[PDB]
Amino acid sequence: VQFKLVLVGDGGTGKTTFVKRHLTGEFEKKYVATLGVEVHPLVFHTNRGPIKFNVWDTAGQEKFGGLRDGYYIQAQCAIIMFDVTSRVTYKNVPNWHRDLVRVCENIPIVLCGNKVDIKDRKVKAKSIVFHRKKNLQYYDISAKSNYNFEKPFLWLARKLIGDPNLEFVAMPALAPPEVLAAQYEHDLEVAQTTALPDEDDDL
C-alpha cells in the first residue's frame, strides 16, 4: 500500500525541511541544496491501516535539477511548494505545475505556501488563487511552527485511498524493554554543556 509522491518548487522554499520534519521531527536550520533528488519512505497510521509515501524530494535550483521532470514519471500525487516571504517563488508555481502535469496528467496535487511563521509576509492570502482553476488543494503551512504541517498528507491520503473520512490514528505502543558507565558520562558531559536551541520558544 504505497504511493509515489513528488515534491517540487523553487530552491530555498523548504521542501527538504518539511520532509525531514515528518521523517525525524527535527527542524533543520541550514540550507543545504538538494542535488537532483532524495527518496524517503514515509509511513502514516490511519483508521484504514498504514499508508506509505515514497517521497521524491527534488531539487529546486536549476543548476542542481538533475533529471528534472524525469523524476515525475509514474508519480501518484504531488506537492508544489513556494515561500510566502518570496514573491518570485509564487510567480514560478505555474512553471512547476506545467512541467508536473505534462508527465502526471491526473494526480491529486497540493499547493503549499510555506514559512507563514515569518511576520513580514510578502505573498498575501488574497493573491493566492492559482490553485482554483487547476483543482489543487491549497494550504498555508510552516515547517518551523508545524502549522498545518500534516494537512498535505492527510488530504492526499484521503484522495489516494478514496475515503473522505480517513483519519490519522495513534500507532501502537509496545511495552519497552527494562534494561560502560564512563563512555556515557563523556557523551552526557558534552550534552549538558551544549545549549538547547530556540530557548525563547513557548516549548
Binding site: 508545524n146 504541517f149 500534516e150 490519522f168 500507532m171 534494561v179 550534552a191 545549549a195
Partner: peptide, 23 residues
Amino acid sequence: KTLKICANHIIAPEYTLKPNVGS
C-alpha cells in the same frame, strides 16, 4: 497531529536528570 511515538521507555531507577547550561 500525526500522533507518532517519539519516546517510549521505562523510567529506569538508574537514570539521573541533569540540567542543561542553556535552560
